């Protein structure tokens, strides 16, 4: 379930977001 770029831990009960902290995840992916 990570088809965000190529198209457009726990589970959150308040929202149904098809990940809270990406501010520094994608940046480290290019390293």
UniProtKB/Swiss-Prot annotation:
It is found in: Cell membrane; Basolateral cell membrane. Residues 1-31 are cytoplasmic. N-glycosylated. Detected in erythrocytes (at protein level). It comes from the Eukaryota. A dimer in solution, but in its membrane environment, it exists primarily as a mixture of dimers and tetramers and spans the membrane asymmetrically. Component of the ankyrin-1 complex in the erythrocyte, composed of ANK1, RHCE, RHAG, SLC4A1, EPB42, GYPA, GYPB and AQP1. Interacts with STOM; this interaction positively regulates SLC4A1 activity. Interacts with GYPA; a GYPA monomer is bound at each end of the SLC4A1 dimer forming a heterotetramer. Three SLC4A1 dimers (Band 3-I, Band 3-II and Band 3-III) participates in the ankyrin-1 complex. (Microbial infection) Interacts (via N-terminus) with P.falciparum (isolate K1) aldolase FBPA; the interaction inhibits FBPA catalytic activity. Functions both as a transporter that mediates electroneutral anion exchange across the cell membrane and as a structural protein. Component of the ankyrin-1 complex of the erythrocyte membrane; required for normal flexibility and stability of the erythrocyte membrane and for normal erythrocyte shape via the interactions of its cytoplasmic domain with cytoskeletal proteins, glycolytic enzymes, and hemoglobin. Functions as a transporter that mediates the 1:1 exchange of inorganic anions across the erythrocyte membrane. It is linked to Ovalocytosis, Southeast Asian: An autosomal dominant hematologic disorder characterized by ovalocytic erythrocytes that are rigid and exhibit reduced expression of many erythrocyte antigens. Clinical manifestations include mild hemolysis, intermittent jaundice and gallstones. However, the disorder is most often asymptomatic. Spherocytosis 4: An autosomal dominant form of spherocytosis, a group of hematologic disorders characterized by the presence of numerous abnormally shaped erythrocytes which are generally spheroidal. Affected individuals have anemia, jaundice, and splenomegaly. Clinical severity is variable. Some individuals are asymptomatic, whereas others have severe hemolytic anemia requiring erythrocyte transfusion. Belongs to the anion exchanger (TC 2.A.31) family. This is Band 3 anion transport protein. The gene is SLC4A1. The chain holds residues 803 to 835 of 911 of the full protein.
């Amino acid at each position: 379930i990570q088809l965000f770029d190529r198209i457009l831990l726990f589970k959150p009960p308040k929202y149904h977001p098809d990940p809270y902290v990406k501010r520094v995840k994608t940046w480290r992916m290019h390293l």
